[PDB]
Amino acid sequence: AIGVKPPRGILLYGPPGTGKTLIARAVANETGAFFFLINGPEIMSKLAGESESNLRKAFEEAEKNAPAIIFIDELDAIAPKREKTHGEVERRIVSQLLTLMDGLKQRAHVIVMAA
């Protein structure tokens, strides 16, 4: 019906504390999709060299199941503007995220979501 890739990538912006985690949890536990979320500060907590570790593995685990949805939380901590990125590893992490996001196009119809 539509071959122009119905949209991969949804932002959940707005005020904090409005249950944006709860929306993704309800969607995950209702829609019947295998859910593989990862946390923002958890992967920021990793050291240099291990920062790509579990960042590649989350998208690999999304590729493991043919229906799959992930939901990254607190992307504001992950990806600020280039002026605020005075550290090299933050730019490397957001480059890895962008590379894994645009390298995977319409592969096993996965949906990514962010709050």
Place this chain on the structure above:
Amino acid sequence: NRPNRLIVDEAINEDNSVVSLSQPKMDELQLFRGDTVLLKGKKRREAVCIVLSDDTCSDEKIRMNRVVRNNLRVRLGDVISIQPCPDVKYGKRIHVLPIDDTVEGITGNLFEVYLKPYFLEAYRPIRKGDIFLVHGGMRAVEFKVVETDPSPYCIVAPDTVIHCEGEPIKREDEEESLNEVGYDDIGGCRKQLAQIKEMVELPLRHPALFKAIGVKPPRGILLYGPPGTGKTLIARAVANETGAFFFLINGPEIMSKLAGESESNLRKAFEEAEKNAPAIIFIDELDAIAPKREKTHGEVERRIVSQLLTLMDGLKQRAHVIVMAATNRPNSIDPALRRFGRFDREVDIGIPDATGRLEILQIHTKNMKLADDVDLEQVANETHGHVGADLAALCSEAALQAIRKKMDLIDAEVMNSLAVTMDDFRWALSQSNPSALRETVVEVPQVTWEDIGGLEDVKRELQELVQYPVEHPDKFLKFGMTPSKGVLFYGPPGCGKTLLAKAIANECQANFISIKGPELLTMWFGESEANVREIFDKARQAAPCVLFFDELDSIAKARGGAADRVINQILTEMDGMSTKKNVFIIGATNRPDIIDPAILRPGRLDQLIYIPLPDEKSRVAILKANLRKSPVAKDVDLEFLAKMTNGFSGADLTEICQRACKLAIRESIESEIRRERERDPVPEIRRDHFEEAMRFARRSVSDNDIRKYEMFAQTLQQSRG
């Protein structure tokens, strides 16, 4: 020339690997009854078949069935080229593959059961990558030749042992290896695509043509502009058309690599680009790789862009390689890569216009079964500030809106009878938030020059100041004298000064860039006066063009008891423009009070034109062209209101038109309301609505202001000391 021109059409013969042609054109091409050809069509696809003679077939048309037409990825009506292939060798090993969604329900080998009776001494020449249909088991299953031992082309002999290794993959077998969309997938920038093709025509079909051009026109083209305009897709279409080994990399893809891994694949892409004598490469998202020194804060990215600056001119004159660039901002790239040695040429895609968006919608709604009810034209002209990827998103949202009025249990009939409506396009258009606005984009107006009351002396004066240097370049060298590039407008605040500027922009058929004074102070509010320089550079790149600086009273009212550095920047880069390039600048104000008389100097915008009140046929002329969701007023005395001078002072006679048609709106809605209450709405507008709008009317500009402008009829004598 090019005697292989053919048009695809419906076939008379149902043979899968045999097409039909015409006998005298076969003898023109020296063809035969059983020879083999190489049909090259769009998306650089190739098909090998055997041409049979057909008397009912046209001379300039070719007939091919659903096997050959889907082999070239073309629809009904495309253009192909035919080259006969007389050097065919015989096949030794043949490997074919099935499709996963067409093999369920039947089990067993397809070699002796399906491949054997289809190739039972059939003498069908096959091409690698082509799809052939085999009928069997009360079905029709498609199979694709993937590898042969004569790998380009062969003839299926009975002695040819055919492999039967079964690996069904997908229906999308050609979506990742090539993605072979060509110039049919790009519209709205035909001039820019033609310029890009003429730049890259030294890689393609002019290989050793450097004796005639020893300057080697530049290695490195920039494709800047707004985001989401198909800058990646332009490069993909060019690389598919040229056929050279393409080795594109992404900016974040190489920023994801570590230190030491950074030089890895950066040296390797440029080294692998050397191995082909035709070679074009491209690097994506240059702002990730090449920012300014102030933006970056790491030594690794600066070492990466230093290595890129080394490897740009480290290779020279070697296999005439061309690098290509893509970004979303022109000044964001480092100026070390804007030198004349490296990455010299800069072209901009921009956004398409209404004709361009119409072309994009027409080539985009092909792969979607509409209901054949929409017009595709109001949506085309409506979507100002909508970029092409946003147009694709609008198409997907309209498809989702058309799907969403159905059942979740899918249907027995929604897949083969899907449809979209015109109201679906309106609802997708209403609930759409594009990011392609806020840019001072280029457009050509459509403003039907008799729609004004006319001001025929002033319109002829604008004609003489603009278009006679434009349309007569011989009169720039034979007769006449020095020109006056620019004109200023002054008079009443509410008049058609913007209307005259866009009118002469349309009548000149030149580009119309109309920035705003509040928009200028908005860009200055971010502390950036180089934006005026970038506006003038966009003007020079948009040659020929017409420039408009409206609302100079907004600049004039910030005098003080902010600052007027923006008009000083404009005045500095007003006389710093060439008398060539056929650029032209229009200025306009509302009052002559604080007009900063340093800008009235000759050598700049000099002609001061005082616009008077227009004649009695101004609102007649907007009611002459009254399309405006409304019928034309009829059986009414129009000049009788001009006798009463219904706010007859400059503009805002369209205010009387708005008031009277809103009275007609009230009348029609009240008629509908008591028609609904009861259980011809008078769409035309009659005399009492115009008379009541005269009753509720006020003058727009006072007589004292008219007296002041009459006193300022000779205001070219400024700078009083």
Place this chain on the structure above:
Amino acid sequence: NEVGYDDIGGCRKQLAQIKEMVELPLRHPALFKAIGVKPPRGILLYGPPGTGKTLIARAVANETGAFFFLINGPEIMSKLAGESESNLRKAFEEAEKNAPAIIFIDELDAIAPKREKTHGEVERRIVSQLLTLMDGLKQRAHVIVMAATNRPNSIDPALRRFGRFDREVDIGIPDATGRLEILQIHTKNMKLADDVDLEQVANETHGHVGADLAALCSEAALQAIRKKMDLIDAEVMNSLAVTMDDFRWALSQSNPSALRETVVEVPQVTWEDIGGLEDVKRELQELVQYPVEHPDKFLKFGMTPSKGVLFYGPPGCGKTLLAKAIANECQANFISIKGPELLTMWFGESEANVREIFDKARQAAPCVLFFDELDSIAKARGGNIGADRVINQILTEMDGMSTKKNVFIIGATNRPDIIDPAILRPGRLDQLIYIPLPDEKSRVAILKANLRKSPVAKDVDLEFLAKMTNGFSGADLTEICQRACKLAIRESIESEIRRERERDPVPEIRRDHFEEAMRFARRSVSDNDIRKYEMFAQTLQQSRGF
């Protein structure tokens, strides 16, 4: 292949300076008895980008025959930590290992920017390594280094001391004759159609660097290829050509990259086109040209010079062209910055642009300055609070201009009341020249020098412009000439339209064209401002303190 001395044009003076600097690795190798200084190592080349900084160095290296070991900026900076010494020590080692030699570094801003602009420590390490190996290799085997950039003040100023990189030579933009020479040496490897002139294109191009003229030649040749039907043979190879319309097309779809640089050349305005200002011409001639071409007469008895003068009068008056006139008949290059252009760099607290302008004035001696339109600065300091801060930069920098070095300063204003009266009351800018409403024969002089698609108006009443006195308030009488142009264009399109609908263009402008042009003409300044301006005929009584 390799290139020599004949491929540089338009900067023969600077090229001769470079040849004189490399004359010591040449015909005078052991020139130490004549001078013991060893005149300085470290030739610094600066100016616009793409102007041939690699080409001049390579040509000088091939003429001298010395061993050339050049390195680039970002090529050296592309090495990692620990490999910055790699090839940077080794280039100087190879310069040590063979005596008659020259080395060169390109893009010095990539290697050595200012230390505040640096972020990483390896950039500081690299600039300290350069600062060690520059004067550390002193009087060893007589090697000369050369440095190229795109901007001089972006270089680290520690690299511009006496011992390091002192002889700053500017390549600059080429001249119009320099553009002609660049096109002449660029059409060697191209068989033209022998129909262009290469001169009207050259003077019609303005502010294009030699790389841009090379790109213009490429664009014209690509246009001539594009208009031809493509066929894969040599029948289009031997028939390569360029047309005059191809050069006009290449001049059209291009942009002057060297525009907005403050231009340094001599104009071509040729004194005879003045309207009849004789006393002002004689006084400006005596105050400008007389010290220049007669230095022996300017050293015996008479005039100890007092430079600096400003023009004033009506706002629409003819005061701009006289600076160009003394530039033509003084044999001095003309530098004319704009008063509106000063506030562009005043916005942002950039005081160094005026320093760069006066440094260019020092470098381009002899020269005549022209600060046009100080009334814009007066407007910025009068309409609001402030603007009037670069006018203090003007007064401070102009006292750095000594009485020698062959410089002059010309002011310009329209309303002399608010031009900050400390400008003119000391010996700085002491002289005042009134520029009145002009003499009667300006209309023929406009018609003489500006030929411009039409001859002199034949058998017309020339004296009627002195009789009816059209535009009789100051200058800008040339509005009547522009109106005659518009009426001539109207007659031409009338004849063209009539001969278009029917199936002698009349290129002569008659008396009735001027008579009709009379009606669309007014004065240029109100009479009360005229009475005030000849009330300010004696306006040197400024600093009106109570």
